[PDB]
Amino acid sequence: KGFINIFPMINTTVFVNDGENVDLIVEYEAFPKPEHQQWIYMNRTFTDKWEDYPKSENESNIRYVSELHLTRLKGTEGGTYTFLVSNSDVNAAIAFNVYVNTKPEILTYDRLVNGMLQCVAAGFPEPTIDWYFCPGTRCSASVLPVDVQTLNGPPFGKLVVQSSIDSSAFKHNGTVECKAYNDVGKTSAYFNFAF
Amino acid sequence: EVQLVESGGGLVQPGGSLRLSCAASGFNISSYSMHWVRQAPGKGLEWVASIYPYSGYTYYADSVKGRFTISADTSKNTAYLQMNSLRAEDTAVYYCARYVYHALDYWGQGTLVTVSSASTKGPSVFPLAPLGCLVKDYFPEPVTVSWNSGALTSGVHTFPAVLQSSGLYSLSSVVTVPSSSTYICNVNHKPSNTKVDKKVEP
Amino acid sequence: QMTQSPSSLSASVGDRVTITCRASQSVSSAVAWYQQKPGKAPKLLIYSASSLYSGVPSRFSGSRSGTDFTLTISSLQPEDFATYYCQQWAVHSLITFGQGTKVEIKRTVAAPSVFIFPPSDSQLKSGTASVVCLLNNFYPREAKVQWKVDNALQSGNSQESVTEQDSKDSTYSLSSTLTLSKADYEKHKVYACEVTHQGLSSPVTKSFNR
Ligand SMILES: *[C@@H]1O[C@H](CO)[C@@H](O)[C@H](O)[C@H]1NC(C)=O
C-alpha cells in the first residue's frame, strides 16, 4: 500500500581527495509520512551536520530532501554512508560509497605453503602490486605469473588486493620485494631469502 | 588541481539566443551541484540556475524561469546554460561554480555576455608618445592589453574602458619609466579577431 | 528579504572591519561570505556562518550579532581592497546574494604626477585628435580635471577613467581624454589640463603647443 522512493541527487559512488568537502544528498517521495530519518556510518548515527525537510509546504506534499555534510575528509573517513528512512508501513535505505585517495597500505605479508609469497595491500585507487627479486649481486623486472585477487574493514573505503607468487622459480639467496603503488604513493614489504 | 572554464559568450542581439558551456577538471560534477551566477556591469552577484548532473534536476531564478535551460554532460564533465529570448537586462558576466555545503567554493573566471543591437568593431591603436598606448573605437568588450609580450608589468595601468558618445568603447594603457633607450604594446580584441603590436617612440 | 550593510566603507591598514548581514528568519546557519577583487571571480572566505575556507588567512572570521551574521577582518591589509558579499541558502528561496559591501582602504594623502599626451600622427591622418591627461598614483580618489583650449572651459567633450585602487600602495590613477576632429584641433594652439586635488598646494596645469 505505502511506498518510499529514494532518488540520489549525486552519484552513490563518491571519489574525493584527502581534505575535500562533499554533500551526500537525496530527494525521496514517501507515503505515509516518513519518520526516524537517520544517516549511519560505522553503525553509528549522525546527530549533527545533516538536514532533512519537505520539498514543499503544500499540505498534500510527499517529496522530501535529506543532506549529509561531509567536511575535510581524511583518508580514514571513506566507506559506506547509509541513509535510512521509514514510515508506518515501509523501510527504505540507500548506501553511498565514499572513497578517499590514499597511498597503498600493506595489511599483511606472508610465507605460504609450497614456497609461495603473498602480500596484501589496501588503498584507493586500487593498488597494483609488483614483485621484484633482488639477488646478492640491481633486481629484476616485475615478475609473472602472479595470482592477483580482489578481497572483500578496517580499512574502510579502500580496495583490497591480494597478490601471490611462487618463490620456487627463483634461484639464489636474495631479497624479494612486493611493492604496492597507486597514483597517490607507494609502499613495500620485503622477504629475506635463503636457497 | 581544480579548474573551471566558461566559454561560448559574446555579443548577442536582443531576442537572440546563446549557449554557454563550463568545462570542469579536478572533480566529478556528478558528485556535486553546478550553478550559474551572473553579474551585471558595475552591479552585484545574482544567482541564475543550478543542476545536479547525476539526477538531471534543475532550478531557476524567477527572472530567467521559462527562458533559460541549464543542463550537464557527465561524460564530458561539462555543464551548460542555454539562454533564449535574450534581453539587454541579461547583459552580464556569467560564472559557473561548484556548490557544496550551501556555498560556492570553486568558480570559473567568467564569460561576458553582451546583449545589444550594435555591431562588433576592431580598435585602432595609437602610441602615447612620452609612455602609453591608446585603444580607440571598438565594440564590444573586452580587449586585452600586454606590454613587451608580458615582459613588463611594473607601473603598467590599463584603465577601465569608457563608452564614448559614438557608442564605441575606448581605453588607454599606460606605464611609467625613467630615461631608457624597447617598449611595444600588444593589443588583442578577440570579438573581431584583431591583433596589433605597436612600437612607441619619443 | 536578505539585506547587507554597510554598502560601502573606508578603513585604514591595520584596522578591524565588520560587515553585517541580515538573513531570512528561517535560515539558521547557511551563510557564506565571498571576496571579489575587481575583474576577478568571487572567492569563498567563510561558509556555514563561521567555518573558514581552506587557504583563507585567519584575519577573516564569521560570527553573530546575534540574529544577524557578521564578517570580520582584523588587521586589515592593503590587499583586502574588494567588494564583499554574503549569501544565504534557504529551502524555498534557494540561493540569495547580498547587495555587496565595497571596502576602500583609507590611506595617507598623496599628490598625483600629472602628464599630458598630444595626438599621434597616425591618429591625425585618420582625421581625429585625442589628447590624454594622466594623473598617476594619488589619494584620495576625488579629483577635479578641467580642459582649457586657449582658456575655454570645455565639457562635456572629454571622457574620464579611473583605475581600481592599487592592491599595494592603495593609490589611484586617472585618465582624461579630450576628443576632437582634426579640423577643430588645427584651429586652437594651446591645450591645457588643469588638475585640482587635496594633495596639491594649488591647482596644477599641464599643457603644450600644437
Ligand atoms: C556514477 O558513478 C560510477 C562511478 O563508479 C560511474 O561508473 C558512472 O559513470 C557514474 N555516472 C554518472 C552519471 O556520474
Side-chain angles (χ1 to χ4, degrees), chain A residues 1-136 138-195, chain B, chain C:
Chain A
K1 256 297 184 300
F3 64 88
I4 303 185
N5 296 320
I6 301 178
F7 311 101
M9 290 291 106
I10 66 146
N11 203 336
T12 48
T13 297
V14 191
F15 302 153
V16 303
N17 294 315
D18 180 280
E20 177 73 300
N21 301 313
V22 71
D23 292 344
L24 311 189
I25 159 178
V26 304
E27 178 169 345
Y28 63 95
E29 55 178 351
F31 179 80
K33 298 188 169 274
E35 174 48 19
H36 301 109
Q37 290 97 330
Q38 55 177 5
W39 287 85
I40 288 69
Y41 175 70
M42 297 301 104
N43 290 327
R44 295 159 179 89
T45 306
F46 281 80
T47 45
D48 202 351
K49 295 297 172 299
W50 76 282
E51 321 157 37
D52 161 84
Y53 54 87
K55 200 80 187 294
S56 171
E57 288 194 351
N58 171 317
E59 189 218 341
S60 62
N61 167 67
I62 63 166
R63 299 284 296 221
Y64 300 81
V65 179
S66 190
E67 183 175 3
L68 186 64
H69 299 297
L70 298 184
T71 52
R72 292 154 162 134
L73 286 166
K74 297 173 174 155
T76 60
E77 285 165 343
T80 309
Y81 295 73
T82 305
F83 175 70
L84 292 165
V85 59
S86 70
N87 61 27
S88 64
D89 183 86
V90 182
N91 304 273
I94 195 179
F96 286 78
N97 305 290
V98 184
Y99 299 96
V100 188
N101 295 343
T102 55
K103 64 180 296 175
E105 184 188 356
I106 286 182
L107 307 180
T108 64
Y109 61 93
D110 288 284
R111 300 180 186 265
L112 272 35
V113 56
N114 291 325
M116 277 174 55
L117 304 182
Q118 178 184 277
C119 71
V120 170
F124 184 89
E126 183 191 307
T128 290
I129 307 189
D130 279 14
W131 295 83
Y132 299 93
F133 178 58
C134 323
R138 52 160 296 185
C139 279
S140 72
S142 190
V143 308
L144 297 175
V146 170
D147 176 42
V148 175
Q149 184 179 338
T150 178
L151 272 44
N152 295 268
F156 315 99
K158 306 295 173 190
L159 300 161
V160 175
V161 169
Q162 170 192 300
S163 178
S164 313
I165 64 162
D166 197 334
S167 75
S168 299
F170 285 162
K171 283 178 175 277
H172 324 336
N173 283 6
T175 295
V176 180
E177 174 192 354
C178 81
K179 169 151 73 190
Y181 64 95
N182 62 22
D183 280 352
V184 196
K186 61 192 187 63
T187 190
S188 297
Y190 297 93
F191 302 85
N192 287 322
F193 203 89
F195 198 99
Chain B
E1 177 57 7
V2 174
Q3 184 195 1
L4 284 172
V5 189
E6 306 89 338
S7 60
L11 182 52
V12 172
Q13 305 170 333
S17 63
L18 189 55
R19 195 242 248 171
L20 317 172
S21 80
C22 172
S25 71
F27 71 96
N28 299 305
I29 62 175
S30 58
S31 297
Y32 296 88
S33 183
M34 303 298 291
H35 299 234
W36 285 92
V37 174
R38 70 183 181 181
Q39 181 170 48
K43 300 198 189 73
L45 300 161
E46 184 188 31
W47 180 76
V48 176
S50 67
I51 183 171
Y52 288 106
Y54 183 84
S55 73
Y57 282 42
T58 60
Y59 309 85
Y60 300 87
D62 308 87
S63 49
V64 311
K65 221 126 165 182
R67 200 167 50 91
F68 291 7
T69 306
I70 190 179
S71 71
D73 185 294
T74 59
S75 79
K76 276 173 287 296
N77 215 47
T78 302
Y80 307 91
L81 183 58
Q82 167 73 30
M83 300 159 69
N84 285 326
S85 298
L86 283 182
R87 310 191 274 256
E89 59 192 0
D90 296 309
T91 285
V93 168
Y94 289 70
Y95 305 96
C96 61
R98 185 186 88 161
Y99 173 93
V100 65
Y101 215 148
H102 305 299
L104 301 173
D105 59 350
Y106 293 97
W107 293 65
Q109 76 296 346
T111 186
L112 176 68
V113 166
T114 294
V115 183
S116 178
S117 288
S119 289
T120 127
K121 178 172 179 296
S124 293
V125 185
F126 309 102
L128 279 178
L131 188 153
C133 204
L134 202 168
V135 185
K136 183 179 179 59
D137 297 336
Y138 70 85
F139 188 87
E141 279 298 86
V143 67
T144 88
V145 177
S146 66
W147 286 95
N148 290 359
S149 313
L152 183 58
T153 46
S154 298
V156 179
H157 284 358
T158 304
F159 291 79
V162 176
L163 192 55
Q164 304 167 122
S165 57
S166 51
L168 303 175
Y169 292 103
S170 68
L171 67 75
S172 56
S173 179
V174 305
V175 62
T176 76
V177 272
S179 95
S180 301
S181 291
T182 172
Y183 301 96
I184 295 174
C185 69
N186 320 78
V187 171
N188 185 31
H189 185 239
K190 294 176 186 295
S192 63
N193 188 35
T194 321
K195 292 176 181 175
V196 173
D197 281 355
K198 187 151 313 305
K199 178 66 174 301
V200 185
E201 305 173 354
Chain C
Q1 203 167 358
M2 178 152 163
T3 276
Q4 184 183 342
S5 64
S7 61
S8 170
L9 73 87
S10 189
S12 302
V13 162
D15 247 38
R16 168 184 311 262
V17 188
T18 280
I19 303 178
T20 290
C21 200
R22 173 90 51 134
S24 297
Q25 294 198 1
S26 78
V27 23
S28 159
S29 194
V31 173
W33 288 95
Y34 307 83
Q35 174 196 66
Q36 187 178 41
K37 259 98 169 189
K40 299 293 252 178
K43 292 187 173 188
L44 176 65
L45 300 172
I46 297 282
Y47 65 96
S48 187
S50 52
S51 294
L52 187 73
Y53 187 59
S54 307
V56 180
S58 313
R59 305 200 301 271
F60 304 93
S61 77
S63 298
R64 303 294 284 269
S65 185
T67 214
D68 298 338
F69 299 89
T70 54
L71 176 64
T72 301
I73 320 179
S74 48
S75 108
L76 182 71
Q77 230 53 17
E79 54 265 43
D80 296 338
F81 158 83
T83 298
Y84 294 85
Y85 292 96
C86 57
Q87 81 108 342
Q88 63 158 45
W89 178 92
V91 173
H92 296 300
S93 57
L94 304 175
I95 303 274
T96 299
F97 285 102
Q99 302 74 17
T101 299
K102 177 199 170 180
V103 177
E104 189 216 47
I105 288 156
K106 198 180 311 177
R107 177 212 191 281
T108 189
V109 166
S113 313
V114 187
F115 303 104
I116 191 167
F117 296 91
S120 41
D121 289 338
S122 298
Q123 189 201 0
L124 285 173
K125 188 62 191 303
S126 62
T128 305
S130 290
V131 178
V132 177
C133 190
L134 173 59
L135 297 61
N136 205 71
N137 298 10
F138 62 90
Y139 189 90
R141 180 187 173 107
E142 191 181 1
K144 181 179 171 70
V145 180
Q146 294 200 335
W147 285 97
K148 288 164 185 167
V149 183
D150 292 340
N151 294 68
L153 273 168
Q154 303 206 210
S155 211
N157 55 26
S158 55
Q159 295 287 18
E160 232 177 1
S161 183
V162 178
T163 71
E164 298 286 6
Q165 198 179 26
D166 178 81
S167 294
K168 282 170 185 179
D169 56 11
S170 288
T171 54
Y172 293 99
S173 283
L174 185 158
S175 79
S176 181
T177 299
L178 179 59
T179 297
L180 296 173
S181 56
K182 181 181 71 67
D184 292 14
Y185 176 71
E186 300 186 318
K187 294 186 293 183
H188 302 95
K189 277 59 181 179
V190 176
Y191 278 90
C193 182
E194 183 148 2
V195 181
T196 314
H197 186 274
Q198 182 186 3
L200 288 166
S201 44
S202 305
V204 166
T205 312
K206 301 292 296 189
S207 54
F208 68 139
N209 64 30
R210 281 187 38 206

